[PDB]
Short mmCIF file of C-alpha atoms and ligand atoms in Angstrom, two decimals:
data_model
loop_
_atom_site.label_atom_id
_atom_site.label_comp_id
_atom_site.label_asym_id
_atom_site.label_seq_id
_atom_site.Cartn_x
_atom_site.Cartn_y
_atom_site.Cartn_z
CA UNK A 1 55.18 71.06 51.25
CA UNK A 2 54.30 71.20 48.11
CA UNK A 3 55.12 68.15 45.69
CA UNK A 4 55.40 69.23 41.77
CA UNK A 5 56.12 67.13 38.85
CA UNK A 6 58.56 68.32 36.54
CA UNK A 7 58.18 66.73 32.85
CA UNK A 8 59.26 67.04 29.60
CA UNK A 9 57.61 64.73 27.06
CA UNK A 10 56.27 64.18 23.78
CA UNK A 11 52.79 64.30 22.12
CA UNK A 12 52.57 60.59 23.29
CA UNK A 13 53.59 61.27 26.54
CA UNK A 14 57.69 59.79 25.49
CA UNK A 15 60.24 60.96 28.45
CA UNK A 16 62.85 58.71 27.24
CA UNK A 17 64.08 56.48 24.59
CA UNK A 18 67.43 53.73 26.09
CA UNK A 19 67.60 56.02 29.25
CA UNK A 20 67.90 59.17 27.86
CA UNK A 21 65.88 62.08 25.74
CA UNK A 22 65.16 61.52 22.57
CA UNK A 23 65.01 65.18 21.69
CA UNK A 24 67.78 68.19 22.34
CA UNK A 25 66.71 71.21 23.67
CA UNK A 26 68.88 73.33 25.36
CA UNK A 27 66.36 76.35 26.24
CA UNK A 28 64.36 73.45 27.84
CA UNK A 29 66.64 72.30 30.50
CA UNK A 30 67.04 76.14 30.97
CA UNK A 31 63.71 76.48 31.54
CA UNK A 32 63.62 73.59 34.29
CA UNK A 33 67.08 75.15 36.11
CA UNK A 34 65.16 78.85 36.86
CA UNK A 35 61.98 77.15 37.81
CA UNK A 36 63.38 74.65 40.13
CA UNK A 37 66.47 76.86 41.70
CA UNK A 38 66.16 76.24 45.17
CA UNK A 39 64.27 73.31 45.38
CA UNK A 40 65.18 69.51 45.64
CA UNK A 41 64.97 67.52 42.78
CA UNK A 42 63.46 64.27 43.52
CA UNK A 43 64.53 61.71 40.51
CA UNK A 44 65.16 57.68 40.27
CA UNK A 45 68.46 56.36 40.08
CA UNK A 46 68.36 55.07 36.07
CA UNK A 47 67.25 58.85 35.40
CA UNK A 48 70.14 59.99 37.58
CA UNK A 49 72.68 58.15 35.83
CA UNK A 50 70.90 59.20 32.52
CA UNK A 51 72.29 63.05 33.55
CA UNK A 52 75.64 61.38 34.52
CA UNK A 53 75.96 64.14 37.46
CA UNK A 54 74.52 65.67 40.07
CA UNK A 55 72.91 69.11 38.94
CA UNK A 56 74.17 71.84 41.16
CA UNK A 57 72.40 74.38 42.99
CA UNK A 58 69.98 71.94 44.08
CA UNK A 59 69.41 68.96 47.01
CA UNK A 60 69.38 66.05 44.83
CA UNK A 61 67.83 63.38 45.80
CA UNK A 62 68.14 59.79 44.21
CA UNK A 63 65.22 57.12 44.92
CA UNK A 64 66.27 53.65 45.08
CA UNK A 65 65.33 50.43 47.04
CA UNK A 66 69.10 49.63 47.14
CA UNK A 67 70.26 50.51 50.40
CA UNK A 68 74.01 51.36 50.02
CA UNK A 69 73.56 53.37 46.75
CA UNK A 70 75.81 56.44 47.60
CA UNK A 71 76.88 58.95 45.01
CA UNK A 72 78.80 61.62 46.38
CA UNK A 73 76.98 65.35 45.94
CA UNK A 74 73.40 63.57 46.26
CA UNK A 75 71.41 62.41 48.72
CA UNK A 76 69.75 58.96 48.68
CA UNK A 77 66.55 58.03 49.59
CA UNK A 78 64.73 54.55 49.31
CA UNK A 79 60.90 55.02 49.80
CA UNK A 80 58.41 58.01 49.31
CA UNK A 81 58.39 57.94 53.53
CA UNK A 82 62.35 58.77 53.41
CA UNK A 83 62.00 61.71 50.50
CA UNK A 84 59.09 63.35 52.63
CA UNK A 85 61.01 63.14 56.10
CA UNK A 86 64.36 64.03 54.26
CA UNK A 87 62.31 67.29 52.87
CA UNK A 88 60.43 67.97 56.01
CA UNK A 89 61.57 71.58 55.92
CA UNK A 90 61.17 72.44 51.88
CA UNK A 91 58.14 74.38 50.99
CA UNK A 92 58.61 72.67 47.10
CA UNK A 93 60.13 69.62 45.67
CA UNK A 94 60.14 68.41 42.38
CA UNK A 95 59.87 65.25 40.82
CA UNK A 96 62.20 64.99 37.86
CA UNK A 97 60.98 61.39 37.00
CA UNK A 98 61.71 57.84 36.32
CA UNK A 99 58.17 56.94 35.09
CA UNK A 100 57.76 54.86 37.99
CA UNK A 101 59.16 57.62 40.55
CA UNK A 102 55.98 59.77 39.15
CA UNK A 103 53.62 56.81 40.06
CA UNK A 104 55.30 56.92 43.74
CA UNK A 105 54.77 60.15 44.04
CA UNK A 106 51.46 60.53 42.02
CA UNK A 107 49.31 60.33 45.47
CA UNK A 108 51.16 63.25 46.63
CA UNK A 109 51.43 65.77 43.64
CA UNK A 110 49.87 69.04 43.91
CA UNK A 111 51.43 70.75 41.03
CA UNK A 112 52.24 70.13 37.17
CA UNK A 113 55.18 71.37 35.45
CA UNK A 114 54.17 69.83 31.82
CA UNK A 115 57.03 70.52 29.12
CA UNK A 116 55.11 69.45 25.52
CA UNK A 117 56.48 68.81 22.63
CA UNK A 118 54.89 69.23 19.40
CA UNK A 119 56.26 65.88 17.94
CA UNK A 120 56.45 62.26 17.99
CA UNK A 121 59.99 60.51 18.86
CA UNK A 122 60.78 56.75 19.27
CA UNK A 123 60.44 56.56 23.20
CA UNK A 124 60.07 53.28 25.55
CA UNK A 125 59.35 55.31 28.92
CA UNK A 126 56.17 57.73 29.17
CA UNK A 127 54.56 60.17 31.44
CA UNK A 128 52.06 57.99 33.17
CA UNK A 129 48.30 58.86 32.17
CA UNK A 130 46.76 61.27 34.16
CA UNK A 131 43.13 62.58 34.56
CA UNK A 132 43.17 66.16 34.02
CA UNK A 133 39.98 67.09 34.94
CA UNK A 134 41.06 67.28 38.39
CA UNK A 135 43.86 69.63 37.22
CA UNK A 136 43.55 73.34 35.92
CA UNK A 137 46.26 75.37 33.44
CA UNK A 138 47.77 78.16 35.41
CA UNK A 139 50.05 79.35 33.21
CA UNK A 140 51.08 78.67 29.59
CA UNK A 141 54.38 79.84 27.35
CA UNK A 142 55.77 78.62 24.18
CA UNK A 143 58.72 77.50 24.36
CA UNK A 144 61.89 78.61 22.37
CA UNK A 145 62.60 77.31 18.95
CA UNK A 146 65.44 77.97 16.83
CA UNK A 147 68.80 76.57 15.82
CA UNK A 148 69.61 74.69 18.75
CA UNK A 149 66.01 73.93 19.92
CA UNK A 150 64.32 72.54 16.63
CA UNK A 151 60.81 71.28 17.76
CA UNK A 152 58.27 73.25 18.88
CA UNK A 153 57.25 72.75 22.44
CA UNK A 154 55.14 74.76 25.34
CA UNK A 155 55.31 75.05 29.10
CA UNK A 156 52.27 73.79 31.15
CA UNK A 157 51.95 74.51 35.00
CA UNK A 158 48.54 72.82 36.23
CA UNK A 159 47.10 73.52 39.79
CA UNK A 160 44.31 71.13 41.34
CA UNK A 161 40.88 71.89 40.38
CA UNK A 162 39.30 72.83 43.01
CA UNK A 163 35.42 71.75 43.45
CA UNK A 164 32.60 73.15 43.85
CA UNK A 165 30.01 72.07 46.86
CA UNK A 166 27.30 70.59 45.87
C1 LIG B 1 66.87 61.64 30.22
O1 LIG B 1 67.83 62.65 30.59
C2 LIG B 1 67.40 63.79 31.19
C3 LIG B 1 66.15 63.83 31.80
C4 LIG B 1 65.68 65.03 32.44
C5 LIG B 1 64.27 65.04 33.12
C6 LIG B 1 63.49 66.24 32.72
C7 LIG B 1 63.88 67.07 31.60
N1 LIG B 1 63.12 68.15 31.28
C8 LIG B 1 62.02 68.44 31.99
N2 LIG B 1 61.23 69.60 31.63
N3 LIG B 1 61.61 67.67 33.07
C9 LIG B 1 62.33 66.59 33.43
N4 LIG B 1 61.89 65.75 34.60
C10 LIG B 1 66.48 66.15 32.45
C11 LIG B 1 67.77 66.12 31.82
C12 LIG B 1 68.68 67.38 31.83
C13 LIG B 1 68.84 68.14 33.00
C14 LIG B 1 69.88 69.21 33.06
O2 LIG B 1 70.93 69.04 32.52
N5 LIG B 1 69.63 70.43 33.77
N6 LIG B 1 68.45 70.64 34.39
C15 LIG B 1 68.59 70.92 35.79
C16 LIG B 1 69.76 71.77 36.14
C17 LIG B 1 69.86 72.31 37.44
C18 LIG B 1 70.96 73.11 37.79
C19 LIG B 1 71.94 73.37 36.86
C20 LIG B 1 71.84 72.82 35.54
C21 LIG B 1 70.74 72.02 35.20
C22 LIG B 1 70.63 71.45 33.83
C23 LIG B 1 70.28 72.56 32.84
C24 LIG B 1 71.37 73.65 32.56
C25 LIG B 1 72.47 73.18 31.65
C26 LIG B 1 70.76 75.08 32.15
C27 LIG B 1 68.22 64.93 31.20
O3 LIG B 1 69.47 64.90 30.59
C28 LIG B 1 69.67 65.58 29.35
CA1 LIG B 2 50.01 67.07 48.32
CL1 LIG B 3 64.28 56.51 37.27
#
């Protein structure tokens, strides 16, 4: 199974500003639809209720300690233990976030889906730090910017490094 992060966040790492993005771009969320299709989305309740529904085509699955948080369409799971056993079968799942989801997870994660945004927005949640050194780019695209998708932003997807014996 493999366990990805999916993130999109500013040159200070900002994922969200009052529970939701502080930036709008459409070819974006595009971008995370194709590359998750087919694959549960693993995300914390406040980030859940920051989409307001559940995003079809996909298992989601809501993380909360609150055991009789239903929403119908979603499943709900309340520790990393439940997520794994719930995706026993899945050969990818994605965390979508909740800062604190990504630090749950971050023991697990063998795969970065990095949205970056070339700009700075007011934000009060962030990607948690990372080193990278134990990560490698495998691919790289800018993303689309135009009318409806003013900043200029890239798409990351980083692999472990593997080592070298000594
Ligand atoms: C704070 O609010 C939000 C946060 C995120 C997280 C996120 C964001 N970007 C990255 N790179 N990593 C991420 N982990 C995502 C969304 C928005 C999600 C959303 O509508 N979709 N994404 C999944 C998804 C899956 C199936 C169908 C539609 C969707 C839509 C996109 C459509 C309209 C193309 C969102 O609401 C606007
Ligand atoms: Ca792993
Ligand atoms: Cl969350």
């Amino acid at each position: 199974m493999i366990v990805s992060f999916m993130v999109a966040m500013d040159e200070n790492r900002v994922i969200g500003k009052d529970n939701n993005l502080p930036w709008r771009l459409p070819s974006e969320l595009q971008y995370v639809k194709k590359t998750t299709m087919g694959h549960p989305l693993i995300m914390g309740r406040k980030n859940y209720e920051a989409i307001g529904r559940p995003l079809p085509g996909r298992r989601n699955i809501i993380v909360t300690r609150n055991e009789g948080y239903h929403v119908e369409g979603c499943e709900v799971a309340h520790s990393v233990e439940e997520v794994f056993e719930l995706c026993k079968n899945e050969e990818e799942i994605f965390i979508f976030g909740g800062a604190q989801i990504y630090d749950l997870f971050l023991p697990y994660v063998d795969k970065l889906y990095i949205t970056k945004i070339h700009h700075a927005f007011e934000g009060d949640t962030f990607f948690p730090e990372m080193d990278m050194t134990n990560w490698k780019e495998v691919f790289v695209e800018k993303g689309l910017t135009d009318e409806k998708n003013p900043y200029t932003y890239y798409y990351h997807v980083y692999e472990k490094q593997q080592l070298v014996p000594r």
